[PDB]
Ligand binder design. Structure first.
Ligand code: F9H
Ligand code: F9H
Ligand code: F9H
Ligand code: F9H
Lengths: 256, 257, 257
């Protein structure tokens, strides 16, 4: 289960059915939960906590220090939840003290080859980061979001739930929930109706979100004006409230 | 032949004469390696996979992994690499899926540069160059002598024409006709690869005929049906123009404009 | 001790006494490593290659490989890295070609972040930052304090000026003058790096001269001939406008506009 060619630090805690492949390093203060398979040629650094039924593939560096010139060796953390797939050559950096000292990943996330998750980023659940997606730092990715290949995200951006970025997008402003963005710089194109159908949203909820999109994007309304007008629809449909909350929380401005 | 003793060779693996495997490489079950093939250190080969003769695979490459795109993998799906290919550092090459071809296929004399990605069910021909960080999403067909420049991204189901050229950072969502130069995200057709035609020793008359073939398709407001009819005489006279005409006729889902 | 027993050190390797080499790393023939330098695990160092003092090279880096460029034919070419450099996860640095000066050179205090690529015959200065996935095609000159943000792509023979800044996803095909800010694919000149200069301790007067300098080249309709003339005067009063004027003089590919 633990390959003999692997290096397991004395201070690392592993669960019973944890598999570690050859030429992998499990460093000091790395906990790894039940059902988790660490491939060959993985480097894990701590303090890091990994959940259960996770798969980390070869040439991944999970829990390295950020090279960000404001980090200075503080004992910052990385937390990964359950049922995640981290593919080949992914880099995940621990938090910085300037902002909560923790990088967090939720459950059922799929982080494809050579993706980069920067210091202090927060991923939710059921997210897909396609190959070479890069989160600069302090990026919040809400549940069910899809960032397509080579999507670049500037520090401090919020990517809303069920949002979609096109391949090679460069995001500089918050992406609201359900919104589709494309290009460098990314600009909003529509709502992720496909994404909503893929979760059996009530058709009334899809029609409600289509209306909400128009209130914000296609009616010359200011953000305050749009939020005001979304109030009733929000209180009526919890689906619309996610959208409403994602704009309200974006006082860095929204991706247009 | 030199098999590094720090390598892991699965007992079901088959190595031909003069195969080298560097330290800390894995040749997994049902991997066949052809004569004179050099596997570097830190390579992961997974099967079922057939690699031909006189290949070179560099460190940190993962060759014959399963696509992450399916949660519940099907087997058997295959990867076939031919002869005299160079696969540089960190390249990822996924096997096929049961849904579709069940096989990812690379021909001969290809150069796949560092951190390139070849997705499931893709088909590469001969004498192609995929520059660093080129990414084929899946079901991509790259025909002979095509050059994808650095950080080219190709949507699933796209055909990249023979002797075509994509500029660095291009994102291709439609078929690229043979010989055409494309640039941008999203990719736009700019001109023809006249440089490659000359480098490959095409005649000035074939080059001139292809310069006119481009104008017929792109600059005269013809339906593709009408462009194809306008090219039929040129295509009959020049096999190089028939390759162009064929790549346009085979593009049911439209060409990069 | 300091050399991990699981590392491979070639007999013809010269390591200073306090040099750390982590497990499953290779130090190839004719690799020289200077005092203080820490080599991580799973690193491949190939020669002939000189690494200076107090360097740090992270896992999955390939430092000193041959270029795949078809114009290299196995000649004895080198790589030189200076002191106090940080090379992160998965970086690729290729050695020179005989067609230039047979050397790839890196200076001191450089930060080269994950999966960056430094191609054959590139020369990096001092205090540069190459963010994740930056790619220099080859013969690229990056001057001191340049920052290339993530996924910056640089065409061969391009010069990146001192104190310049390239935005995420930039694709540079023409020289970037010193102090200039560029964004986009293709790259576009979008003023000068005033924030970097102010923080670097440049004088109010130098910044003001540079603003007029920028107008001379970019906003007055002058040619490079014309504009270089017009800078002479200011180039005398300030070193900075000299560095700027020099960057425009040496621009063999034209300048980013
Ligand atoms: C089946 C499908 C419709 C899905 N798809 C995928 C795609 O990138 N579509 C797209 N993005 N931006 N504009 N279009 C690729 N895909 C992928 O995950 C994929 C895998 C490797 C490389 C890449 C690339 F080229 F972008 F670097 C992508 C995926 C993942 C989630 C959602 C959609 C798509 C695609 O290309 O065809
Ligand atoms: C290709 C696939 C069968 C799988 N898939 C994807 C998915 O998120 N499935 C899922 N939903 N809920 N739980 N799992 C999203 N996806 C996709 O590739 C995808 C394709 C077209 C359009 C879109 C959308 F909604 F964003 F416009 C996405 C992908 C890529 C890799 C792995 C899994 C999946 C999907 O929707 O169809
Ligand atoms: C000598 C040459 C004329 C060729 N060339 C190369 C190039 O990228 N040209 C180009 N791309 N997009 N637009 N033009 C790079 N090159 C390369 O192989 C190369 C290597 C590393 C990184 C990159 C980059 F920058 F694109 F990420 C490229 C190559 C390979 C085949 C054909 C042409 C070119 C180049 O830059 O100068
Ligand atoms: C703190 C900061 C203002 C700086 N910054 C950084 C950035 O790339 N800014 C930027 N690029 N183009 N337009 N803006 C990211 N950053 C980084 O080094 C960084 C780290 C990981 C990934 C990336 C990405 F996604 F672009 F690949 C970048 C850095 C390094 C030096 C200077 C500025 C910035 C950023 O996003 O927030």
């Amino acid at each position: 289960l633990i390959d003999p060619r692997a290096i397991i630090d004395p201070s690392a805690r592993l669960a019973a059915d944890v598999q570690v492949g050859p030429w992998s390093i499990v460093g000091a203060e790395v906990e790894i939960g039940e059902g988790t398979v660490i491939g060959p040629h993985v480097v894990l650094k701590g303090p890091t906590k990994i959940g259960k039924h996770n798969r980390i593939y070869q040439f991944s560096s999970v829990g390295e220090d950020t090279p960000d010139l404001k980090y200075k060796g503080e004992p910052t953390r990385l937390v990964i939840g359950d049922h995640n797939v981290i593919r080949e050559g992914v880099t995940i950096h621990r938090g910085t003290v300037q902002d909560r000292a923790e990088t967090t990943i939720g459950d059922h996330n799929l982080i494809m080859a050579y993706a980069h998750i920067g210091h202090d980023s927060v991923i939710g659940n059921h997210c897909i980061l396609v190959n070479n997606t890069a989160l600069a730092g302090h990026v919040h990715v809400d549940d069910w979001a899809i960032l397509s290949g080579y999507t670049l995200v500037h520090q401090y951006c919020r990517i809303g739930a069920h949002s979609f970025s096109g391949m090679g997008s460069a995001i500089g402003k918050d992406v609201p929930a359900y919104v589709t963005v494309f290009g460098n710089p990314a600009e909003a194109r529509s709502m992720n109706f496909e994404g909503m159908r893929r979760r059996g949203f009530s058709s009334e909820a899809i029609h409600a979100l289509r209306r909400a999109y128009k209130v914000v994007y296609r009616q010359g309304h200011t953000v305050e004006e749009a939020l005001a007008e979304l109030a009733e629809s929000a209180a009526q449909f919890p689906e619309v409230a996610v959208f409403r909350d994602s704009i309200q929380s974006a006082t860095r401005g929204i991706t247009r």
